[PDB]
Amino acid sequence: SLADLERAARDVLPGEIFDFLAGGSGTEASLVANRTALERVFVIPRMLRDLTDVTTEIDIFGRRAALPMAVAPVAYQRLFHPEGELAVARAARDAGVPYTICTLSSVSLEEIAAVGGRPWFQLFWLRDEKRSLDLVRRAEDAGCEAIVFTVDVPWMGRRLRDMRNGFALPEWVTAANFDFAPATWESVEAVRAHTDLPVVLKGILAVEDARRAVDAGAGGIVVSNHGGRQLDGAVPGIEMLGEIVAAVSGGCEVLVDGGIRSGGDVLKATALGASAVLVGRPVMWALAAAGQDGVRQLLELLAEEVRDAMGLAGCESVGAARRLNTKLGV
Amino acid sequence: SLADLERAARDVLPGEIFDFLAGGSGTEASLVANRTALERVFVIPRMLRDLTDVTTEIDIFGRRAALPMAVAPVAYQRLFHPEGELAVARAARDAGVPYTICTLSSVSLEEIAAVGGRPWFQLFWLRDEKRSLDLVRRAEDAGCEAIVFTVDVPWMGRRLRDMRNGFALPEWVTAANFDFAPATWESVEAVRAHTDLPVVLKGILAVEDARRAVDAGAGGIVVSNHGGRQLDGAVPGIEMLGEIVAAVSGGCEVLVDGGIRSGGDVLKATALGASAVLVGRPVMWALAAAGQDGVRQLLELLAEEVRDAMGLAGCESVGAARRLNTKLGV
Amino acid sequence: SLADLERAARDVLPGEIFDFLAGGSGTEASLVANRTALERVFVIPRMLRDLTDVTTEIDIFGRRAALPMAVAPVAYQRLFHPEGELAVARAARDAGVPYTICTLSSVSLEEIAAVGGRPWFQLFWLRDEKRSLDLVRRAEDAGCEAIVFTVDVPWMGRRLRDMRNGFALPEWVTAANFDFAPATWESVEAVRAHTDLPVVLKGILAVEDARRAVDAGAGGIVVSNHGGRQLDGAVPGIEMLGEIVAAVSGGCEVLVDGGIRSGGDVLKATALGASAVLVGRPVMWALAAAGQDGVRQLLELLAEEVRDAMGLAGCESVGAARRLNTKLGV
Amino acid sequence: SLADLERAARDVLPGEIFDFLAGGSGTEASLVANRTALERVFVIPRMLRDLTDVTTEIDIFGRRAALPMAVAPVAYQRLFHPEGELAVARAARDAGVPYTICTLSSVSLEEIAAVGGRPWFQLFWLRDEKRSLDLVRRAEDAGCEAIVFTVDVPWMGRRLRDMRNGFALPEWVTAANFDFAPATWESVEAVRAHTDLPVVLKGILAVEDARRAVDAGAGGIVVSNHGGRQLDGAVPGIEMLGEIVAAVSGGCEVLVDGGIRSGGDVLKATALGASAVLVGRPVMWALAAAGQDGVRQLLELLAEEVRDAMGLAGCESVGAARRLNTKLGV
Ligand SMILES: Cc1cc2nc3c(=O)[nH]c(=O)nc-3n(C[C@H](O)[C@H](O)[C@H](O)COP(=O)(O)O)c2cc1C
Ligand SMILES: Cc1cc2nc3c(=O)[nH]c(=O)nc-3n(C[C@H](O)[C@H](O)[C@H](O)COP(=O)(O)O)c2cc1C
Ligand SMILES: Cc1cc2nc3c(=O)[nH]c(=O)nc-3n(C[C@H](O)[C@H](O)[C@H](O)COP(=O)(O)O)c2cc1C
Ligand SMILES: Cc1cc2nc3c(=O)[nH]c(=O)nc-3n(C[C@H](O)[C@H](O)[C@H](O)COP(=O)(O)O)c2cc1C
Ligand SMILES: O=C(O)Cc1ccccc1
Ligand SMILES: O=C(O)Cc1ccccc1
Ligand SMILES: O=C(O)Cc1ccccc1
Ligand SMILES: O=C(O)Cc1ccccc1
User: Fold this and answer.
1) CA of C66: how far to CAs of A3, C58, C302, C323, D209, in Å?
2) DSSP state, residue B279
């Protein structure tokens, strides 16, 4: 289980860095709710279906992925291990999972993309529409296959663990893509007009924002409260997911994140209608604990857990898993 | 109470064997939910009815049973006591309760059936349609009166207690019926075509699978998440039971299992519409603690608890108990 | 508060007697649910109403009572104090609260009634229709003003505290009215035909049993699960009360019991539609702790708490309190 | 966070005074429910809106306030610090927040009003309609801009912490406005006829009392259970707020109080429809801990938390925050 890795990472990382990773904003209400919400979801499995060729593969944004999952954008991964983003990206490539390269990556995006695999690029909107679009163009020129535009960070949430810790970036970690302003719908349009890559808006929670994202020409959204790190009291994405999937009615891919910690959790998200999930903190636990081989082992365990869960639920494909029904417990 | 027995069994059994017995898959969410779900159910008892002739008997699959209960299939019972299945089967016979002989029994099915009583036989689908049907034919020739086809095990769930324990069958426990593949609806048909015994599909949770089971010629189903040992996050059977009973509308017997630990719990399952229940772990606690006489004492306590509960609720018969209403609490 | 008294009684009483008093049947699910259910109820108070003449009085079964409350039937009160029922009955009389004399009283019913006040008499149905009716006639001849026919005890619930304790009546406590069989609707009719007193059926939880009680000529019912001492898993009366009040639509008085521990709890029961409440265990705590003066002090504290709660909620009368709305919390 | 201040105040204040401040009535059910209720509310934030000019200002009762918040009436503030109400009022003025001067203030209302800022005056109805109206006239002559008529205190709730503590006002704290009777709707009319200031009824929880308040010519209400200090078991205001806002349909300002402990909580109240909130206990923690500068720091932290929350939720104005949707969690 992914629970094994969390303790291993707690042991190795400096306390303040473990807190930067684990923490949420405010009283951590949304952080805790991400888990509570998943725990309340029960799947109604189907029996006696053909499982001779169970596959966890999906096609997303033009490409085959080995699982309905990608590595979430997590800034400054050298905080957790000296190889940082390169270790994660290599493991992701080898697992057939898309890796999201961050605007605030601690290794340059061009170096990360050179690893190969299916890199996506996460955008934070800069000060200058021109620099933002340069970053997009860099990503595209480097072979990234989607732009994950983070839209829930007009500014950063108040992380009281960091404030209490007086936590700051070590001098040996930098924003390697560099030598910020709130995004609007106009910024989305500027991005969409300047790339042929799918634009994916990350941090959508309202139904009318999901519909507007489709109208705006997004190729996907990530239904997300940013891992409980942005508005404290924001609803978990998993609680809005079903309503959002019904509202877009196939008009874009609908991803979800927040608290996904097992293959069963992936199955739950799928059954609620998600195209795929992102996974954040667990990938960093595996990185901290054992570098590249740590993340590879995590991804292999997830792969096995997702296949197991699907077959136990009577699903030979992710599409079938999306047609599962659920029941909320207490 | 059945709680007495659990500690007695914890004291006598080797830790790893107690864990094989107690554990569920994954994070044990479905294991815990089986109990939570029962605990939330309240019965609305009726008063002032004639109780001069209260009976707990039912007719099921051709035969009278003393209680609306059978012993669930539990593999490898010599793990818990040296007399294993023979001790349980004798106690069951003497109590007038059906005993389910397992495909993976640690005493041969013919020896268990020779004990007498009302044996049923649980089938796991083998590799070879021909060997599966041989096992069915053996059971029928031995006098088993129903085939309990387990349909929730295309493969085994990941039991993290066993994995952590590195638990494996002792060399002194074997699958005595021997000298596996996923089941499908085609396998059900092959069984149904080859026996005149009622075929009971164990591990149904979806309403449309219950209806299809009727259409397929099943004589019953067991609404079950396999004691929380198969898909972690599968809904408890008790949560689907009422919906399933309404959907089959008398077309087959509808049994339930998972967490039944008292006569009051039997009453709750009955009031939700179950024809009968299966009981698993408590029977093995009694076996571990005191062998045959242990299981006899358990069954006598259950019998007394079921009669007590029925009469306190104004029910002179199990049919009347099925007409009780319930209310969900928090 | 009534919480003060509970510890005082725990200190003075022998453990096994405190357990006889405190305990419920089975796993004590219904015992705990009585409290949970009250705790979930919130009152919506009204403001700015005339409170110049707030009164807690009600008319019930022909007579004025000082509060919408009576002392519940509790058998064998000499278990708790040497003066037993006489101490409780005197305090009740002095407080203007009806006292329920038990069939299993440890002082004869005629002695208790001689105390004066507003005694009611609780009936358990005997073996012999003739002896049952004699007991009723005795009660009526002694000046009791209602027959509280307990209808939830075809036999006694399994009290595992008592069983574990091997608890039995001390030799110095006897059933003083003596020198039992399940009740039916026919028994109710026999009682109703033989007395002009109001017949009150205690232990009704199903709506159709409440309606039938009206049809049967009951002058009241007590919506009750017998303090969690009868069917373990029976719904709390407070959860059925609103539905029952709507169903009888003024055809009899509807009382409730189970867990009433404050004037606020009385207000909650009133707001849900109860005519009055019974209070059991707290009266015995006060008796154990301080005899007659103990029960008087309890009743004075309740009186003050009920007036306080009513006025804070804008109710000058109990009728107004019945028109309060409520909201369920979590 | 406001949690920092609570411990600081616990350290400095005498135990019995900390209890006078913290406590509620009865079993403190309503006190705890105020927090529970807020914790169950999740906001659905909006993204990608223009936040170039985020403002937390509102217009209320004729005047601009810097935040959608006022300092609640809290009697006898010299209990917490020697400068008492003057320290709080100065900080409030400097923060641009209305300060509610109490009828039971420990510094005279004219001295508090001389501080300047936006003082409101809270009225308790006196014995004598003439003295009540004198107090109103004093407040108006001193420059108070609204009368906050407390309508939930026909008398004081039973504060068991105070009773247990034998707590009484120190001899060095007095009701400085002096040298009481239950309010009715007639008292509201007498106030409304005698002032041109907006009359705000504090302690409304029933929908029909909110509508009647509008009909009566109130310029606002405060939906409130008096911080859990009046009826124990009264619903939290936050649970009635949405229903009340829909019922008045713009006919008066609708404020709420009870448990507001962060800017996120203000956002939640706004999203449920509140015009503004009151904050009580936290202001007294800050006063106790650090006098005037303590309250100033609290108000600055709240201001920053409210702006943060609004912008993270896509709201450039409080009006926009009122149009946010919410979802209840568990
Ligand atoms: C340490 C940390 C840094 C993050 N950095 C970013 C970021 O730069 N961009 C972004 O869009 N999301 C960022 N996220 C949020 C994740 O992409 C994701 O939404 C969240 O972590 C998912 O929740 P999970 O960690 O519970 O799986 C970060 C998350 C964490 C924990
Ligand atoms: C140790 C163990 C072994 C089991 N073996 C089998 C099996 O061979 N076949 C099967 O259909 N169910 C099997 N089950 C599941 C039970 O038949 C039953 O569904 C479950 O135990 C009921 O839950 P309960 O144990 O809470 O009463 C097993 C259960 C346990 C605990
Ligand atoms: C020790 C004990 C003895 C009781 N004896 C009787 C009885 O003889 N007849 C009866 O109708 N109810 C009996 N009751 C139940 C009470 O009348 C009442 O329904 C229950 O105690 C109410 O719950 P409360 O104790 O929570 O207030 C008894 C209750 C207790 C605790
Ligand atoms: C110590 C104390 C004294 C109070 N005095 C008054 C008062 O004189 N008048 C009034 O209307 N409310 C009074 N209140 C209630 C507050 O105005 C407010 O409704 C409540 O404190 C809001 O809850 P909060 O403290 O959780 O923020 C008092 C509250 C406390 C804690
Ligand atoms: O997006 C986040 O929660 C992580 C982050 C951390 C530090 C600086 C920018 C972003
Ligand atoms: O069916 C089960 O949960 C029990 C089982 C244990 C070991 C091997 C097969 C089946
Ligand atoms: O009615 C009850 O719960 C109390 C009781 C105790 C002992 C004998 C008869 C009745
Ligand atoms: O209104 C309140 O809860 C506080 C109060 C305390 C003491 C006296 C009057 C009012």
Assistant:
1) 61, 7, 11, 20, 29
2) E
Calculate the CA dihedral of residues C146, C147, C148, C153 and round it to 10 degrees: 180
Is the residue at C85 inside a domain? yes
Q: What 8-state DSSP symbol labels residue D124?
A: P
- Residue C27 to residue C33: CA distance in whole angstroms: 11
Angle between helices A129-141 and A185-193 (to 10 degrees): 40
Cβ <8 Å between D50 and A233:
no
Experimental method: X-ray
Contact check, Cβ <8 Å, C158/B44: no
* Non-local CB neighbours of A310 within 8 Å, separated by 6+ positions: A54, A56, A267, A316, A318, A320, A321
Domain that holds residue B135: 2-323
Percentages (nearest 5) of helix, strand, coil residues in chain D:
45, 15, 40
**How many Cβ atoms sit within 10 Å of the Cβ of residue A144?**
25
Pairing relationship of beta strands A147-150 and D63-65 according to DSSP bridges: unpaired
- A328 in Cβ contact with A58 (< 8 Å): no
Buried (b) or exposed (e) across C114-128, using 16+ Cβ within 10 A?
A: ebebbbbbbbbbbee
C203: left (phi over 0), alpha (psi -120 to 50) or beta: left
DSSP annotation of B234 reads B
Q: Is residue C329 part of a domain?
A: no
The single residue of C90, C118, C226, C229 carrying the catalytic annotation is C226
Q: How many CB atoms lie within 10 A of CB A240?
A: 27
Three-state helix/strand/coil letters over chain C: CHHHHHHHHHHHCCHHHHHHHHCCCCCCHHHHHHHHHHHCEEEECCCCCCCCCCCCCEEECCEEECCCEEECCCCCHHHCCCCHHHHHHHHHHHHCCCEEECCCCCCCHHHHHHCCCCEEEEECCCCCHHHHHHHHHHHHHCCCCCEEEECCCCCCCCCHHHHHHCCCCCCCCCCCCCCCCCCCHHHHHHHHHCCCCCEEEEEECCHHHHHHHHHCCCCEEEECCHHHCCCCCECCHHHHHHHHHHHHCCCCEEEECCCCCCHHHHHHHHHCCCCEEEECHHHHHHHHHHHHHHHHHHHHHHHHHHHHHHHHCCCCCHHHHHCCEEEECC
Please state, in angstroms and rounded to a whole number, the distance separating the CA atoms of residues C263 and D10.
31
Question: Which ligand 4 atom lies nearest to the CA of residue D31?
Answer: 26
Q: Which residues line ligand 2 at a C-beta cut-off of 6 Å?
A: B 20-21, 34, 72-75, 102, 104, 122, 150, 202, 224, 226-227, 229, 257-260, 278-281
Q: Six-digit token pair at A131? A: 């620099």
First to last CA, chain A: 24
Q: Is there a contact between C101 and C121 (Cβ–Cβ < 8 Å)?
A: yes
Resolution (A): 1.8
Q: What is the CATH number of the domain that holds B202?
A: 3.20.20.70
b/e D157-173 (16+ beta carbons within 10 angstroms → b)? bbbbbbeebebeeeeeb
Indicate if D226 belongs to the active site: yes
Judged on CB neighbours under 10 Å (0-12, 13-18, 19+), A9 is: buried
* Residue with tokens 């304790």, as numbered in its chain: C165
Helix (H) or strand (E) holding B276: strand B276-279
Residue A287 DSSP SS3: helix
Q: Pairing between strand A58-60 and A63-65?
A: antiparallel
Residue B82 placed within a domain: yes
The ligand placed nearest to the CA atom of residue A105 is 1
Q: How far apart are CA D220 and CA A96, in angstroms?
A: 61
Q: How many domains does chain B have?
A: 1
Are C321 and C267 within 8 A, CB to CB? yes
Out of B226, B261, B268, B296, the active site residue is B226
Q: Give the β-pairing of A119-123 and A99-101.
A: parallel
Q: Is residue C303 part of a domain?
A: yes
Residue A160 with chain D: CB contacts under 8 Å: 1
